[PDB]
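Fold this: Neurotensin
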Amino acid sequence: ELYENKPRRPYIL
């Protein structure tokens, strides 16, 4: 998506 959220790229990585 154009708007990147945090539960897609959370600090879990």
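The two ends are 19 Å apart (CA to CA). Residues 2 and 8 are 13 Å apart (CA to CA).
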